[PDB]
């Protein structure tokens, strides 16, 4: 497979790759370009739909422009965009396999004109000349007369009707509606009989919309269209009447169900297809059986008549061989969820086929040379910088309902509600569906495996095509008219509340009285539920005007703090399904349970079912429990029969459970998802209101006597605060999502499962009675045998209880959710250092791709738990670049790293991000560090952190939380400072932070920058988990190693070094007395069985060597003290370990007994093998200091 990327609209008509063909049998012709075998691209708009559509027939959400794709430049841009999308798809294995399958999956060819697919007739040609003796009449060549006689139905005809070109797919531009991707067939009859037919695709790659917080990649839409076309190619299109319920139209005051075709659900992916397509299958139709039977028939025909024939080209034969290599189940199991995981593309996953009703789309223009590459969106799917399209003003809006809120009878407000646009059905579908018993009574990322790309690439192209005379029937445009109702009411609907939060005036004002807002003639009020923000605004009202940048900074900080506190407010309550984090403000917005008192109070004294306005929508499905048929048999054989019946009944009881689950999803979860969509629309409205307020205030300030530099700084601070507010709003959205999803699940648990249990409880009796009757009707069995069998083949309640709360949670989780979880990070910089093989790599792995510039002079050593930057040479610098490092006014962050200073203690800078005065700094000063933070208004805050003496490992963790105006600084695992930074304004400094040595060699390890404040528990956990690495360390913190000279200290006495003392012609280790505290301490050495080993590990067994005669440690058997013997043979084998919470101190063990000190004995404290419990447990912890 190779996509031809060397074509342009100006390419000559060569009749081989660029052609001018006819549109079906009409009088129009169009130009087509072949970018791959049997795949063509036609940039011009689709010929079928008429460009001029009467306003009555225009559909909701559509964009109509008859001048689009009329000029050649637009056509060339469209063609290049299609080629780029195809290249992006083919860049991945899944896309290559899909495209190869599309190319090879030609429609089945019709038989010879006479009929059959077996063999052609024969002919003879070339009679030899009359020889001297023999006439030689019969000496001639033999030919298959109708070679390649197979009639084909996939061909485009030239304008002259004298040439035909093979084609399976033809990608056109959009039809009458600019934004409507569609896939249509060539012949309806051939798309359902299993023969197949060519497909035509309408695609619009220049427009996309934003869902949630990401943009939609058109490649996914193209893949969806291609998958839908695959059905047409294989001729397995189901009847248009095979629809299924998709969503309950809650907004209507009637029982109406929206319906979706099976193909659309199976192809579109998402979470909807997961409730259908279960094991066992609860939904079934004759379509699947007919398709499988026809596919098997065609495969048999190919295998018994096509392969043997030697009078037909391989262009068709080899393609058909690969076409039937795959199975129909593979196609049915192929959906967008697989490509989303393969391509790591986010897409809508809930009711993605009915998004028109949930929220209105805003379209953005895509420049393909620039915004989209073979690797997807430039700068990612989230950070791509696109521009809102100018066609958004031409979007058609035909509401399905027009709510006219009144009051006595004066219309205060008028809101519009839009439909899904899918086919509807008033008749109940669940109540009239029979879960079948004698069908699907078994079966209680591998779909495209059978495709072989290389073989497809080896296929010769089709040159000569024998055309089928009638392969095109006609095109039937679909005309639709959208209705519009008027539902008058006096109780405001949620949509009215949502619309009350939008405005056009730039000098509006927040208000909390909905009636006051709507009754406003001036239209100067906007409804908002932000209590704290409005209260603060009213507090400052009638105060001194804002003139100084200091006042503006304080005002903006307070506004941001109040907005975040209000939006993220939650209250935890105890529900049966654990604990739920309810949203306090969900009542004031959307006008739900807003009658009085706290919303949480009503939500607790009333089930979560109360949120939705349409309850009790269940319907009992039809049940067909066939009775056991009869001939006698022995207990040995009858037992297997009864066991099989038991299993079949269990499976049927699931088929029903699954049906009830699908009912819950379609009728109950739809309302909760609608509530989610309405709630996240309010958050964006409030964010827009706050941003407009801030912009208005900044504009007012700009008309003041202030320097340009300060104004630019204020503008940058506002820009950063906008990102901060966006982050807060996203947190609120996540909280809303989690809360409402949990509410829906617990609604299923507490409101539907009991009814399912009740219904089956009335059905298990029938099965039990039938089984008992059948058992009693059998003669060849003992009475005790019958009683035992009845006791075995009877169903209790617990026999049909399938509820699994975790399975439901994993059922409403889409690939998009997994991708978001994977892509969610709290680190703006997470250093990763590797030495490799003379190829040292230092880089950020948090995903923010910080530019790191380091000199080659740096080195890497194993500091604590990995490679650590080692700055030794003077004037060594390391710089990290990132926009987020600019900080600002309202943003909380934290630095965390491990430091070791090998120098002394003059002042010396270590890390800084200062720009003249603004920023933060760290530097050694005296025998400790100093942390300095300074704003652009002169306010400073310098803290001195003592006890940072050299030759020790320290764990620095600094946190700045601007929500509480709290500064936390930890060293090791202790809290040193808890100062307040309420007077610290904008610290906008720079995009790069420099790390320098300045004549002091240093190890720096595990540098990390977090975009949030940290807690003491987090610091303690990280500090103690980092050091849990199976290595024993000296008091300094460096790895303990064998053969190194050390000094031994006891944790209880951290200033006394043990020394040898001779007593009773024996040498024991004791502690220096208070008076004689000047004697030089004894020096030790650790030996090991494997002398090659250097670095000590936990549980290691070794021998302690003490230095003239090379003494060794032995344990006296008379007094239990530790003595010294001049022989390694008699020395004991000590085991080394350490405590997790005392990282730098180790423990000796022998025979599972810890060595420890002893109580005072006439100015001595011996080293002993203790067993008494009267010695404190801290006395058996030792420390080794480098000597």
């Amino acid at each position: 497979m190779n996509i031809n990327d060397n074509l342009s609209i100006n390419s000559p008509v060569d009749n081989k790759n660029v052609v001018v063909v006819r549109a079906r049998k009409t009088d129009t012709v169009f130009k087509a370009f072949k970018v791959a075998p049997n795949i063509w691209v036609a940039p011009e708009r689709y010929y079928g739909e008429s460009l001029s559509i009467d306003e009555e027939y225009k559909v909701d959400g559509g964009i109509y422009d008859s001048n689009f794709l009329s000029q050649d430049s637009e056509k060339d841009k469209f063609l290049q965009a299609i080629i780029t999308l195809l290249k992006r798809i083919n860049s991945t294995n899944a896309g290559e396999k899909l495209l190869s399958l599309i190319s090879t999956a030609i429609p089945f060819p019709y038989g010879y004109i006479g009929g059959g697919y077996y063999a052609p007739n024969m002919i003879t040609f070339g009679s030899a000349p009359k020889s001297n003796k023999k006439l030689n009449s019969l000496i001639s060549s033999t030919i298959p007369f109708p070679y390649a006689g197979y009639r084909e139905t996939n061909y485009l005809s030239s304008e002259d009707n004298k040439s035909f070109y093979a084609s399976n797919i033809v990608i056109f531009g959009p039809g009458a509606n600019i934004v409507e991707n569609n896939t249509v067939f060539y012949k309806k009859e051939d798309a359902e009989n299993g023969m197949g037919t060519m497909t035509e695709i309408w695609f619009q790659p220049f427009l996309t919309y934003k869902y949630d917080e990401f943009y939609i990649d058109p490649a996914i839409e193209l893949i969806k269209c291609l998958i839908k076309s695959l059905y047409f190619l294989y001729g397995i299109k189901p009847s248009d009447d095979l629809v299924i319920p998709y969503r309950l139209r809650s907004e209507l005051e009637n029982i109406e169900y929206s319906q979706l075709n099976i193909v659309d659900l199976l192809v579109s992916g998402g979470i909807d297809p997961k409730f259908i397509n279960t094991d066992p299958y609860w939904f079934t139709d004759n379509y699947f059986s007919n398709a499988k039977k026809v596919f098997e028939d065609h495969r048999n025909i190919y295998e018994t008549q096509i392969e043997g024939n030697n009078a037909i080209g391989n262009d068709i034969k080899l393609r058909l061989k690969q076409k039937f290599r795959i199975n129909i189940n593979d196609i049915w199991e192929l959906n967008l969820n697989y490509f989303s995981k393969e391509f790591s593309i986010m897409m809508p996953d809930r009711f993605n086929n009915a998004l028109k009703h949930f929220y209105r789309k805003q379209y953005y223009k895509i420049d393909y040379p620039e915004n989209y590459s073979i690797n997807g969106f430039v700068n990612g799917q989230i950070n791509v910088q696109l521009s809102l399209s100018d066609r958004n003003q031409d979007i058609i809006n035909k509401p399905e309902e027009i709510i006219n809120l009144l009051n006595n009878n004066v219309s205060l407000m008028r809101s519009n509600i839009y439909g899904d646009g899918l086919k509807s059905t008033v008749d109940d579908f669940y109540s009239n569906y029979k879960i079948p018993y004698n069908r699907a009574y078994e079966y209680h990322d591998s779909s495209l495996d059978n495709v072989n790309i290389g073989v497809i690439d080896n296929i010769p192209e089709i040159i000569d095509v024998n055309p089928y005379k009638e392969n095109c029937d006609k095109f039937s445009p679909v005309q639709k008219i959208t209705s519009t109702r008027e539902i008058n009411t006096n109780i405001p609907w949620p949509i009215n509340y949502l619309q009350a939060q939008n405005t056009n005036n730039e000098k509006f004002s927040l208000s909390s009285d909905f009636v006051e807002v709507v009754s406003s003639k001036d239209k100067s009020l906007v409804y908002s539920f932000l209590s704290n923000v409005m209260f603060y605004l009213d507090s400052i009202k009638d105060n001194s005007p804002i003139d100084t940048d200091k006042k503006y900074y304080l005002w903006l900080r307070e506004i941001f703090r109040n907005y975040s506190f209000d939006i993220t407010a939650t209250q935890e309550i105890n529900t049966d399904c654990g604990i739920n984090k309810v949203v306090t403000w969900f009542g004031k917005a959307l006008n739900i349970l807003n009658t009085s008192d706290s919303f949480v109070e009503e939500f607790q004294n009333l089930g979560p079912i109360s949120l939705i306005n349409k309850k009790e929508n269940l319907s009992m499905p039809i049940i067909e429990i066939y009775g056991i048929p009869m001939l006698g048999l022995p207990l040995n054989d009858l037992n297997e029969k009864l066991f099989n019946i038991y299993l079949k009944n269990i499976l049927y009881f699931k088929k029903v459970y699954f049906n009830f689950l699908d009912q819950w999803w379609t009728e109950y979860y739809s309302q909760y998802f609608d509530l989610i969509c309405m709630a996240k629309q309010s958050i964006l409205a409030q964010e827009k209101l706050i941003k407009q307020i801030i912009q208005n205030k900044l504009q007012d300030l700009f008309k003041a006597d202030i320097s340009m530099d300060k104004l630019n700084l204020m503008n940058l601070a506002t820009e950063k605060t906008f990102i901060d507010l966006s982050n807060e709003s996203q947190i609120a959205i996540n909280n809303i999502n989690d809360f409402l999803n949990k509410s829906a699940i617990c609604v299923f648990d507490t409101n539907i499962y009991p009814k399912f249990i009740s219904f089956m409880e009335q059905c298990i009796n029938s099965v039990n009675s039938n089984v008992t009757a059948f058992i009693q009707k059998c003669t060849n069995i003992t009475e005790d045998e019958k009683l035992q069998l009845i006791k075995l083949n009877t169903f209790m309640n617990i026999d049909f209880e399938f509820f699994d709360i975790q399975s439901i949670k994993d059922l409403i989780t889409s690939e998009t959710d997994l991708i978001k979880e994977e892509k969610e990070s709290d680190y703006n910089l997470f250093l990763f250092t590797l030495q490799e093989d003379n190829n040292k790599v230092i880089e950020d792995i948090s995903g923010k791709n910080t530019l790191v510039k380091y000199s080659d002079s740096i080195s890497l050593v194993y500091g604590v738990n990995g490679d650590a930057l080692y700055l030794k040479e003077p004037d060594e610098s390391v710089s990290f670049s990132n926009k987020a490092f600019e900080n600002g006014l309202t943003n909380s962050f934290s630095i965390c790293f491990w430091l070791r200073n090998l120098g002394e203690i003059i002042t010396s800078k270590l890390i800084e991000n200062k720009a003249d005065n603004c920023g933060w700094e760290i530097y050694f000063e005296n025998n400790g560090l100093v942390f300095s933070i300074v704003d652009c208004n002169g306010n400073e805050e310098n803290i001195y952190l003592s006890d940072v003496i050299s030759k020790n490992w320290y764990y620095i963790s600094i946190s700045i939380d601007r929500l509480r105006n709290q500064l936390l600084i930890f060293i090791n695992d202790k809290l040193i400072a808890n100062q307040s930074i309420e007077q610290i304004l904008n610290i906008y400094s720079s995009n790069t932070i420099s790390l320098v040595n300045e004549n002091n060699p240093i190890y720096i390890e595990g540098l990390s920058i977090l975009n949030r404040s940290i807690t003491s528990e987090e610091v303690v956990n990280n500090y103690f988990s980092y050091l849990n690495n199976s290595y024993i360390r000296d008091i300094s913190g460096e790895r303990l190693e064998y053969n190194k000279t050390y000094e031994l200290y006891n944790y209880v006495f951290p200033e006394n070094s043990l020394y040898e003392v001779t007593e009773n012609n024996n040498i024991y280790l004791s502690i220096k007395d208070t008076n004689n505290l000047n004697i030089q301490g004894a020096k030790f050495k650790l030996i090991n069985i494997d002398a090659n080993k250097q670095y000590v590990q936990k549980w290691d067994e070794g021998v302690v060597c003490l230095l003239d005669e090379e003494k060794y440690v032995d344990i006296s058997s008379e007094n239990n003290r530790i003595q010294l013997v001049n022989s390694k043979d008699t020395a004991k084998r000590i085991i080394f370990n350490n405590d997790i919470f005392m990282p730098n101190c180790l423990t000796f063990a022998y025979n599972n007994k810890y060595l420890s000190l002893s109580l005072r004995d006439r100015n001595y404290n011996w080293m002993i093998c203790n067993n008494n419990d009267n010695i404190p447990k801290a006395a058996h912890l030792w420390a080794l200091k480098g000597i």
Binding site: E442, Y443, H444, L647, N1088, I1089, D1090, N1092, K1093, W1099, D1100, E1101, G1102, R1133, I1135
Partner: protein, 48 residues
């Protein structure tokens, strides 16, 4: 993993599945492939 017939490398094969009698049970064999073993490198710590 199965040791290669000729090359000194381990080829990767696909695990077997239960296909004996019942459609109600399905699992993949585990006691297949080369039998691996972990040997102490230095034998420094106690062998107990």
């Amino acid at each position: 993993i199965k040791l290669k017939k000729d090359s000194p490398v381990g080829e990767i094969l696909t695990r077997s599945k239960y296909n004996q009698n019942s459609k109600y049970i399905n699992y993949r064999d585990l006691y297949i492939g080369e039998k691996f073993i972990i040997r102490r490198k230095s034998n420094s710590q106690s062998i107990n």
